């Protein structure tokens, strides 16, 4: 059995605020599909800032690509020497039309409740 997948907004993982080898699930919008090297570069906006996450895909071929669309990625993170941070994909589904603010508020509320229950112990 594997470890569970905790949610993480793109900008935190972009800054490397998670330990190496952790399992995380995040979101973003695809920007490029490097065919030969099996690499995916998705992007997510934050005000005037744009953040990039590198996704290895060696475990989900065959895989259709939808340029300029949202995605959900779940897997493990490995801190490479030069490439930086890349997530090893285990499941990679596509969702469209789902509004970000509801999701962001949802994880914020869940984190708040978890911390509140953590105040008794």
């Amino acid at each position: 059995l594997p470890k569970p997948g905790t949610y993480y907004l793109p900008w935190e993982v972009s800054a490397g605020q998670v330990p190496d080898g952790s399992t995380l699930r995040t979101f973003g919008r695809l920007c490029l599909y490097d065919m030969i090297q099996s690499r995916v570069t998705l992007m997510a906006q934050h005000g005037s800032d744009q953040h990039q996450v590198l996704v290895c895909t060696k475990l989900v071929e065959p895989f259709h690509a939808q340029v300029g669309s949202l995605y959900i990625v779940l897997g493990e993170l490995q801190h490479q020497q030069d490439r930086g941070s890349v997530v090893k994909a285990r499941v990679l589904t596509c969702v469209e039309g789902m509004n970000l603010p509801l999701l962001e508020q949802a994880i914020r509320e869940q984190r708040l409740y978890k911390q509140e229950r953590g105040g008794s112990q």
Binding site: Q45, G68, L70, G97, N99, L102
Partner: protein
């Protein structure tokens, strides 16, 4: 000696004397500028004429495949245009950031989106919805409340930046409304100022009466242009309207292509005496030409060597630049559509046509209306790649079915000569002046100085 032979094509036509009964021939219905005490004539193309087709970096030259369309292409084109214009407006007006459409916040925020009407019917102030963009809200749709709005003038497919309050994320109340920004004027170079003057005439179809193919207004216009001998002669389409009963019931004895070839031969032979430059712009009502806007120019392989230097065909729309003057050319009726499909409530009386003209100048689109008019076909890919305004044109030519008028907005001259034939009586045609002024002054001045519209 009618060079064209309507009797051969249809020997069952009786001439109509309503056009022949005209009594106000040669009357100038309206004018603008210094048109008093100035002779209205030309050199018949005996001077120096420069032609420059502008617009897309690769101006339309040939044909392209049409009957193949996919929805993601349409979405990509729409979102690219929306995001480009939004970014330009943000750079112009110093907007710090854009709030997502569905974000609920009590503090007023600024949202970017397209103007559309939810109702299937005509647009109205109680049926306005704002549609977002892919890069920020992925096709959001929120109703707009203009009750607090003071003045408004909107049409479907209008790119606006609007600031309001979104409490629950579903209902938005308008609190502000911005305005479009025109493209910078083209700057004439050293060579442009050298040209002193030229004569350009504007004409538009249909060149038939309600039920007569005798082409009497066509012959009279041919005689007028031959006598006047303008430097540049420009005639708009259609050269053969499909609304005629003879072509409706298929009563013609000659092929349509042959009929148009004979008409073009007639025009060339008639204009040979004048020896003036001929420019032909196709229209969406043409029969022999495929009706998808934009469309390739007409094809003619029988042009003589001598006449090749003065006869040309350009795509619709075209941006023809002569002697450093930009001409806005379109064979489509923007004004009628826009007037039929626009709603406004202004605190003061103002010209609706001027508002439409400033809107289309600001929207940076020849046909910014979306969805278009149910009487024509638009290829969205070709429209985006080929039908974008290069720069702000000094002159704009808009044939229309509405009332003839001449108006100037933001340094751009716009002419509405109207149809040359109205029912069974002649319409109006206009004549233009192009005098290059001194570019010494800081303020750019329109080289066009006078215009007169002569009734036919």
């Amino acid at each position: 000696h009618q060079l064209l032979s309507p009797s051969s094509f249809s020997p069952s036509a009786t001439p109509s004397q309503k056009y022949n009964s005209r009594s106000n021939r040669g009357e100038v219905v309206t004018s603008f500028g210094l048109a008093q005490g100035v002779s209205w004539s030309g050199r018949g193309g005996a001077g120096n004429i420069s032609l420059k087709v502008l617009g897309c970096p690769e101006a339309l030259t040939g044909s392209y495949k049409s009957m193949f369309q996919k929805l993601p292409d349409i979405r990509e084109v729409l979102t690219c245009k929306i995001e480009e214009l939004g970014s330009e407006l943000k750079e112009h007006y110093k907007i710090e950031a854009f709030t997502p459409l569905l974000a609920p916040a009590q503090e007023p925020v600024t949202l970017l989106g397209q103007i559309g009407c939810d109702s299937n019917g005509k647009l109205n102030n109680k049926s306005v919805i704002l549609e977002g963009d892919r890069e920020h809200s992925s096709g959001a749709q929120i109703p707009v409340d203009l009750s607090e709005l003071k003045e408004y003038s909107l049409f479907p497919g209008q790119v606006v930046i609007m600031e309001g309050i979104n409490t629950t994320g579903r209902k938005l109340v308008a609190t502000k409304l911005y305005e479009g920004v025109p493209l910078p004027f083209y700057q004439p170079t050293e060579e442009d100022a050298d040209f002193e003057q030229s004569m350009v005439l504007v004409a538009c179809g249909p060149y038939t009466t309600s039920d007569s193919i005798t082409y009497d207004p066509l012959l009279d216009l041919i005689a007028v242009i031959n006598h006047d001998r303008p430097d540049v002669c420009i005639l708009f389409g259609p050269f053969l309207d499909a609304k005629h009963e003879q072509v409706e019931n298929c009563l013609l004895t000659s092929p349509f292509e042959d009929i148009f070839k004979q008409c073009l031969r007639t025009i060339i032979e008639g204009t040979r005496s004048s020896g003036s430059h001929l420019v032909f712009v196709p229209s969406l009502r043409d029969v022999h030409h495929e009706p998808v806007y934009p469309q390739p120019p007409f094809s003619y392989s029988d042009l003589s060597r001598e006449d090749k230097k003065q006869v040309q065909f350009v795509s619709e729309p075209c941006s023809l630049s002569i002697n450093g003057v930009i001409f806005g050319l379109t064979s489509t009726d923007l004004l009628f559509h826009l007037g039929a499909e626009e709603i406004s409530s202004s605190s003061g009386t103002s010209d609706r046509f001027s508002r439409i003209l400033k809107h289309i100048l600001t929207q940076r689109s020849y046909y910014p209306l979306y969805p278009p008019q149910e009487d024509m076909a638009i290829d969205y890919e070709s429209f985006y790649v080929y039908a974008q305004l290069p720069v702000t044109p000094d002159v704009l030519i808009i044939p229309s079915e509405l009332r003839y008028f001449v108006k100037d907005v933001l340094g751009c001259v716009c002419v509405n000569p109207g149809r040359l034939t109205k029912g069974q009586v002649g319409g109006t045609f206009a004549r233009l002046y192009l005098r290059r002024p001194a570019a010494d002054g800081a303020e750019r001045q329109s080289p066009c100085i006078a215009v007169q519209v002569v009734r036919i």
